[PDB]
Amino acid sequence: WTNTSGSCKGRCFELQEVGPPDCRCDNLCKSYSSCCHDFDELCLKTARGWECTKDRCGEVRNEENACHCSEDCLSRGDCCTNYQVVCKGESHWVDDDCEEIRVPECPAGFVRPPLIIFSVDGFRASYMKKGSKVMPNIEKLRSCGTHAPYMRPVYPTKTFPNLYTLATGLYPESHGIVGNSMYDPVFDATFHLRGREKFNHRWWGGQPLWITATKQGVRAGTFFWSVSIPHERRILTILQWLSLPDNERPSVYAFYSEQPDFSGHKYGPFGPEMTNPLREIDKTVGQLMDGLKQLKLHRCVNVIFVGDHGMEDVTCDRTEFLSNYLTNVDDITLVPGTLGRIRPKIPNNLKYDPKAIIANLTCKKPDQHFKPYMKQHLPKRLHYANNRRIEDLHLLVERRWHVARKPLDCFFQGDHGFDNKVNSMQTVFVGYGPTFKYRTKVPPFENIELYNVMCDLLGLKPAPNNGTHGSLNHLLRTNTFRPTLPEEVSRPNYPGIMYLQSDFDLGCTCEERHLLYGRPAVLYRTSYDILYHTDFESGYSEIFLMPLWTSYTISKQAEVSSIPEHLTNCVRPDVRVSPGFSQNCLAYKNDKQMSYGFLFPPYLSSSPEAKYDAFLVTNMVPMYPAFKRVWTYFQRVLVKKYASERNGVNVISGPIFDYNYNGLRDIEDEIKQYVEGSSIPVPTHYYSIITSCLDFTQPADKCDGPLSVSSFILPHRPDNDESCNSSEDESKWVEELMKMHTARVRDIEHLTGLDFYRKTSRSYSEILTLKTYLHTYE
Ligand SMILES: *[C@@H]1O[C@H](CO)[C@@H](O[C@@H]2O[C@H](CO)[C@@H](O[C@@H]3O[C@H](CO[C@H]4O[C@H](CO)[C@@H](O)[C@H](O[C@H]5O[C@H](CO)[C@@H](O)[C@H](O)[C@@H]5O[C@H]5O[C@H](CO)[C@@H](O)[C@H](O)[C@@H]5O)[C@@H]4O)[C@@H](O)[C@H](O[C@H]4O[C@H](CO)[C@@H](O)[C@H](O)[C@@H]4O)[C@@H]3O)[C@H](O)[C@H]2NC(C)=O)[C@H](O)[C@H]1NC(C)=O
Ligand SMILES: O=C(NC[C@@H]1[C@H]2CN(C(=O)OCc3cc(C(F)(F)F)cc(C(F)(F)F)c3)C[C@@H]12)c1ccc2[nH]nnc2c1
Ligand SMILES: *[C@@H]1O[C@H](CO)[C@@H](O[C@@H]2O[C@H](CO)[C@@H](O)[C@H](O)[C@H]2NC(C)=O)[C@H](O)[C@H]1NC(C)=O
Ligand SMILES: *[C@@H]1O[C@H](CO)[C@@H](O[C@@H]2O[C@H](CO)[C@@H](O)[C@H](O)[C@H]2NC(C)=O)[C@H](O)[C@H]1NC(C)=O
Ligand SMILES: [Ca+2]
Ligand SMILES: [Ca+2]
Ligand SMILES: [Cl-]
Ligand SMILES: [K+]
Ligand code: NA
Ligand SMILES: [Zn+2]
Ligand SMILES: [Zn+2]
């Protein structure tokens, strides 16, 4: 019980965290129904609005006023933000020319630039195109500071998963806020956005910025603002906190706006009604900057203007219903809308048939506006599976559409939540201040990367997260992180000819040019061999009986040759590797469901003599015939197409084992499938990393400057049910599938325990940016 009889006198928006039975005067007091009786009266003053007028200049202090225009307001830190403009003839911050902030210009007592995070809900990246005509303050921040054309949110592109990712540097599957609504089967409880359950600490994993700050002796302002607190009061509170004595003043602050999201949902992203909320957010930014200029902090503070996600045109007319595909939807609970998550209505109800449900949702309407996936089959780039709160059955919804349970379930013209690579879901990033670069444009980057940067801006050591520290050093003038190259754990063996062809009873019948960025380092304890060939180089695992990586270079005008008729089933023993550490063909003859493929393709052999190397047992990998349709098309058509378009390509391909879908390389005990009657593990995925020169006029094998990369993590599946057009020729569907499964080099590194690009002429920070790059095809 909380004693509301107490008073908020001289305690309004106190940073002093007090518990029961003492009444609170902070922002969260309303949500916990613990405010002192006089909180609204004393702390939420509204009298005379939020602006000084000429008639108010030099007034007598009236404590009932929302903000002040009296002579003592500056010394008291409670002037209306436009006080110096209206009463002292100063100019608005927006009307001043920007000047480079080479060093922080801070008043006495500030030893470090404070950080202000200005978060805007549903701020689509494209809204920035409106410019100074609609948003002059935001345009000045963007133009004069450091900005990205867009920032990639996390999936689902919903509010709480994205705001909490921004705060922690973690994927939702790791921080636990997997949706705006979620069901935890262990707690047997539902998290809702409009419930008291969301305040329970058990939902919130990882370590958010305000906790990282507090644990390291750095004071933080609130990261939660009550809906009942107007934006002008939020701004005045931040400014009042910035005016506090040296020993009370926070170093990190957060502002939040429910706009332009609110209006975006009502009118859609391209509605004329979108101008009004954009002008309003700009006015709030103007109040903050004028306020900072008033406190002599406008050239001292680092300001981050950031969004959680974008907004798409979504109407009630564009809704698919599960009742149109499934006989009985009454035994199912659906998390609906721009994504779908399906579970039984009764938590542990045994009448629930997941395989029959997926079958009825798979390619059952010609222009179907969603696709079902078992969570382990979702694109790996989404990192959306390793959490008990993520239902096994998922629906990836097409942009502009909704999924609902039945017709019983327009007032809305906009929505968000779709695949995080979707153009309309991209949001904003602007960094302004002494620590950010001046008038600099940076490439798009992911929001998971920001936590490390915010820790750098505050002199904090970041908690373990999913960002790649140093990948965003190019955004900063100072406070850059010096990254350390991961230490190589296992040393390779370099075997020569050690065995006879007669030593093998496998049932089988028959660096300068190819390793351009150095040997990938193996970052775990294992036994592996480096194998050299005329056309390729490989790192052959003696434990997994296959390469961890196969590396080769294809010139722009290289020839594609066929596999000769008599060499169709040709598999040759490798005299450098023991029969005991080799795969066997009897297993592929026995397994009626499993076939095999090759990592280096025989199609791209340099000569008929060289082609025989591609048929080595050490270049073979287990592949389902359905997957072979995809792999053969990539190997025979796409590798050469990419070489022709990019002026040669360097390709690194290999297997991935992720049976427990945690995005990390499996240990031997985690492998759950092997080739029939053998010890050959079955990969869950196959990766490829395709590098060339950013300057396409230079060939891939003779590149002087920055690199260009595209990568994939292809699901190794026994059917092509994911591709609704798979009955057609591979030219009509395989590339579409590969684009959906695009990946960062960093995603492959986590899944393999490998470290790429260790020997280049580029800085390590530039290589980290390259490794986090995602080719979206958007
Ligand atoms: C993204 O970046 C994150 C952060 O670095 C990575 O996630 C980490 O992965 C490691 C390795 O798998 C995990 O380490 C193991 O930790 C447990 C003990 O964990 C507890 O303490 C830590 C530290 O205080 C907490 O962070 C943990 O939090 C998890 O659980 C709570 C409570 O349920 C929840 O609120 C959190 O959201 C979070 O859940 C997520 O992670 C768990 C797995 O821990 C997962 O089940 C869940 O679905 C969520 O995804 C937790 O309270 C420890 O016992 C382990 O021991 C191992 O080593 C010993 C030997 O030393 C072995 O004997 C043993 O068998 C184990 O192998 C690990 O150390 C770490 O917890 C986890 N952190 C977070 C915040 O998720 C991701 O891997 C990165 N992703 C990618 C793709 O790179
Ligand atoms: O409920 C909705 N809004 C309510 C908002 C309260 C207050 N709030 C707040 O002040 O957030 C600031 C912040 C900033 C950061 C940052 F890191 F960026 F700085 C990190 C955090 C966090 F999460 F980590 F704590 C919080 C959030 C909820 C909503 C909105 C739109 C919708 N669309 N559809 N549904 C919807 C539902
Ligand atoms: C609840 O808060 C009120 C106000 O802080 C407390 O009232 C005070 O009680 C003491 C005696 O215990 C008096 O001497 C004070 O004069 C009271 N304050 C005022 C403003 O009149 C009250 O005791 C607190 N405790 C509970 C359980 O209600
Ligand atoms: C999957 O869809 C099929 C229709 O294609 C459903 O099968 C029908 O079920 C109704 C029950 O109301 C029967 O009257 C029909 O005879 C069935 N048709 C056929 C061709 O079998 C099936 O129930 C759906 N499955 C699920 C799990 O919803
Ligand atoms: Ca139907
Ligand atoms: Ca794994
Ligand atoms: Cl959700
Ligand atoms: K077979
Ligand atoms: Na198909
Ligand atoms: Zn949002
Ligand atoms: Zn929204």
CA distance linking residue 407 with residue 409, whole number of Å? 5
Which one of the ligands is nearest to 750 CA?
1
**Long-range Cβ contacts of 358-367 (<8 Å, 24+ apart):** 358/393, 360/325, 360/326, 361/322, 361/325, 361/326, 361/395, 362/721, 363/721, 363/724, 364/325, 365/320, 365/324, 365/325
**Atom in ligand 2 nearest the alpha carbon of residue 180:** 35
Contacts for 459 with CB less than 8 Å, ≥ 6 apart: 112, 218
Ligand with an atom nearest the CA of residue 355: 4
Q: How many residues does the chain have?
A: 778
Residues 6+ apart with CB under 8 A from 366: none
- Terminal alpha carbon distance of the chain: 54
SS3 598: strand
Q: Which positions are annotated as active-site residues?
A: 159
Is 438 exposed, middle or buried (CB count within 10 Å of its CB: 0-12, 13-18, 19+)? middle
The environment of the single-atom ion ligand 11, i.e. residues with CB closer than 5 A, is 261
Which ligand number lies closest to the CA of residue 186? 1
Residue entry with tokens 């705060």: 167
Burial letters 359-389, b for 16+ CB under 10 A, else e: eebbeeeeebbbbbbebbbbbbbbbbbbbeb
β-sheet bridge partners, residue 115: 252, 302
Show the tokens assigned to 82: 């436009």
* Contact 462 CB / ligand 3 (< 6 Å): no
C-alpha neighbours within 13 Å on the C-beta side of residue 282: 23
Type and span of the H or E element at 597: strand 595-598
What's the CA gap between 307 and 260, in Å, rounded? 10
CA-751 nearest atom, ligand 1: 82
Does 170 contact ligand 1 (Cβ within 6 A)?
Answer: yes
User: The tokens of 342 are what?
Assistant: 């399906």
The angle, 0 to 180 degrees and rounded to 10, between the axes of the packed helices 231-242 and 275-294 is 20
Distance of CA 677 to the CA centre of its chain: 40
The C-alpha atoms of residue 17 and residue 216 are separated, in whole angstroms, by 17
| Coil, strand or helix at 370 | strand
Alpha-carbon dihedral 642, 648, 650, 653, rounded to 10 degrees: 30
**DSSP sequence for 626-660:** HHHHHHHHIIIIIHHHHHHHHTSEEEEEEEE--TT
Taking the C-alpha atoms of residue 566 and residue 59, their distance in angstroms, rounded to an integer, is: 99
Is any atom of ligand 3 closer than 6 Å to the C-beta of 6? yes
Q: Two tokens at 385? A: 């599976």
CB count in 10 Å sphere of residue 620:
25
Rounded to the nearest 5°, which phi and psi values hold at 166?
Answer: -55, -40
The token duo for 143 is 């133009």
Q: 3-class secondary structure for 158-184?
A: CHHHHHHHHHHCCCHHHHCCCCCCEEE
What is the DSSP-derived secondary structure letter of residue 137? Answer: H
Binding residue numbers for Ca(2+): 658, 660, 662, 664, 666
| Antiparallel, parallel or unpaired: β 402-404 and 319-321 | parallel
Is 335 within 8 Å of 327 (Cβ atoms)?
Answer: no
The partner residues of 651 in beta bridges, in order of sequence, read: 552, 690
Structure tokens at 579: 């029969």
Residues 604, 632 contacting (CB under 8 angstroms): no
Q: Is 363 left (phi over 0), alpha (psi -120 to 50) or beta?
A: left
Atom 8 in ligand 2: which residue has the minimum CA distance?
A: 224
Ligand 2 neighbours (beta carbon < 6 A): 117, 119, 121, 159, 163-164, 166-167, 180, 193, 208, 223-225, 254, 256, 258, 261
Residue whose pair of structure tokens reads 């309003």 in the numeric block: 280
Could you give the CA distance from residue 768 to residue 764 in angstroms, rounded to a whole number?
Answer: 6
Alpha carbon nearest to ligand 2 atom 18, residue: 163
763 HSE (CA, 13 A, CB side): 11
Conformation bin of residue 580: beta by default, left when phi > 0, alpha when psi is -120 to 50: alpha
Residue closest by Cα to atom 1 of ligand 2: 193
Specify the DSSP class assigned to residue 515: -
700 Cα–ligand 11 center, Å? 44
Amino acid at 355: K
List, in order, residues 6 or more apart from 588 with CB less than 8 Å away.
594, 595, 596, 622, 675
Q: Does residue 206's CB lie within 6 angstroms of at least one atom of ligand 1? A: yes
CB 552 within 8 A of CB 654: no
What tokens does 479 get? 């406070």
On whether the CB atoms of residues 341 and 335 are closer than 8 A, the answer is: yes
Between CA 20 and CA 628 the distance in angstroms is: 65
456 vs 624: CA distance, rounded Å: 47
Non-local (6+) Cβ contacts of 749 within 8 A are 755, 756, 771
Residue 156 Cα, ligand 7 centroid: separation in angstroms? 7
**Quick check: helix, strand or coil at residue 409?**
coil
| 417 Cα–ligand 4 center, Å | 31
What is the distance between the alpha carbons of residues 778 and 773, in angstroms, rounded to a whole number? Answer: 14
Tokens of residue 301, six digits: 């503070």
389 touches ligand 1 (CB under 6 Å): no
- Rounded Cα distance, 315 and 268, in Å: 9
Atom index in ligand 1 nearest the CA of residue 175 equals 37
CA count, 13 A, side-chain hemisphere, 596: 31
Tokens read off for 371: 């696709």
Given a contact cutoff of 8 angstroms between Cβ atoms, the answer to whether 372 and 322 are in contact is no
Q: What distance lies between CA 545 and its chain's CA centroid?
A: 33
Cα–Cα distance for residue pair 685/618, rounded to 1 Å: 18
Longest pairwise C-alpha distance within the chain: 104
Helix or strand (DSSP H, E) at 260: strand 252-260
Instruction: Kindly report the protein residue whose alpha carbon is nearest to atom 26 of ligand 4.
Output: 326
Binding residues for Zn(2+): 121, 159, 261, 265, 308-309, 416
Whether residue 361 has its Cβ less than 6 Å from ligand 4: no
Tell me the C-alpha distance between 205 and 193, whole Å. 17
Q: Is the peptide bond before 230 cis (omega within 30 degrees of 0)?
A: no
Q: Atom 15 in ligand 2: which residue has the minimum CA distance?
A: 163
Measured CA to CA, the distance from residue 557 to residue 701 in angstroms comes to: 13
CA dist 118 and 307 (Å) reads 8
**Structural contact between residues 114 and 254, judged by C-beta atoms closer than 8 angstroms:** no
Task: Tell me the C-alpha distance between 577 and 506, whole Å.
Answer: 13
CA 337 to chain centre: 21
Question: How far is residue 246 from each of residues 104, 124, 241, 243, 251, measured CA to CA in Å?
Answer: 17, 38, 10, 9, 10
Q: Which atom of ligand 1 approaches the CA of 387 most closely?
A: 48
Alpha carbon distance 547, 537 (integer Å) = 10
Q: Would you say 653 and 743 are in contact if contact means Cβ atoms under 8 Å apart?
A: no
| Helical (H) or strand (E) element with 550 | strand 546-554
Tokens found for residue 554: 């294809």
H or E element in which residue 121 lies: strand 115-121
Cα 639 to Cα 515, 539, 553: the distances in Å are 17, 21, 10
Q: Which residues pair with 754 in a beta bridge?
A: 522
Tokens 């190794």 locate to 716
CA angle 147, 152, 155 (to 5 degrees): 160
By CB atoms closer than 10 A (0-12, 13-18, 19+), residue 559 is exposed
Please tell me the distance between residue 371's alpha carbon and the centre of ligand 11 in angstroms: 23
Q: Name residue, tokens 């076939």.
A: 595
> For residue 50, which amino acid is it?
W
Written as one string, the DSSP assignment of 190-210 is EE-TTSSGGGSGGG--S--HH
Annotated binding site: 121, 159, 180, 261, 265, 308-309, 416, 658, 660, 662, 664, 666
Distance CA 234, CA 258 (A): 13
Which of 404, 384, 407, 419 lies closest to 312 in space, CA to CA?
419
Q: Is 279 left (phi over 0), alpha (psi -120 to 50) or beta?
A: alpha
* Type and span of the H or E element at 712: strand 707-715
Which of 174, 447, 525 should be mutated for ligand 1, with most atoms under 8 A from CB? 174
* Contact (Cβ atoms closer than 8 angstroms) between residue 40 and residue 24: no
Q: What are phi and psi of 234, to 5 degrees?
A: -60, -45
Pick from 177, 183, 182, 184: which is nearest to 160 by CA?
A: 177
Residue 330 amino acid letter: D
Q: Strands 685-693 and 707-715, how do they pair? A: antiparallel
Atom of ligand 1 nearest to the CA of 202: 35
Structure token digits, residue 725: 């057009």
Tokens of 545: 């009986």
Distance of CA 656 to the CA centre of its chain: 21
Q: Does the C-beta of 663 come closer than 6 Å to ligand 1?
A: yes
- What six digits make up the tokens of 648? 């040669």
| 8 Å CB contact between 253 and 239 | no
**Cross-strand partners of 493:** 529
- For 153, phi then psi, to 5°, come to -80, 180
- Rounded CA-CA distance 295/616 in Å is 72
Beta-strand relationship, 252-260 and 115-121: parallel
Domains of the chain: 117-170+206-312+427-438+447-475 (3.40.720.10), 319-423 (3.30.1360.180), 501-772 (3.40.570.10)
Ligand 4 binding pocket includes 332 (Cβ within 6 Å): no
Cα 688 to middle of ligand 6, angstroms: 18
In DSSP notation, 415-471 reads: E--S-TTSGGG-B-EEEESTTBPSSEE---EEGGGHHHHHHHHTT--PPS-SS-TTT
In angstroms, the CA 131 to CA 137 distance is 9
Q: Which of 602, 634, 605, 600 shows the shortest CA–CA distance to 716? A: 634
Determine the Cα–Cα distance for residues 358 and 717; give it in Å rounded to an integer: 15
CA of 537 to the centre of ligand 8 (A): 27
> Which element (helix H / strand E) includes 279?
helix 275-294
713 close to 743: Cβ distance less than 8 angstroms = yes
Are the C-beta atoms of residues 257 and 48 closer than 8 Å to each other? Answer: no
From the CA of 265, how far away is ligand 11's center (Å)? 6
Residue 446 CA to ligand 11 centre (angstroms): 19
Residue nearest to atom 23 of ligand 4 (CA): 327
Closest of 439, 442, 437, 436 to residue 454, by C-alpha: 436
Q: How far is it, in rounded angstroms, from Cα 232 to Cα 82?
A: 12
Lookup result for tokens 């427990």: 660
Q: Is the shortest distance between the CB of 5 and ligand 3 below 6 Å?
A: yes
For 287, list phi and psi in degrees, rounded to 5. -65, -45
**Omega of the bond leading into 260 within 30 degrees of 0 (cis):** yes
For 669, how many CA atoms within 13 A lie in the half-sphere containing its CB? 0
- Partners of 79 in the β-ladder: 68
Q: How far is the CA of 427 from the centre of ligand 11 (A)?
A: 13
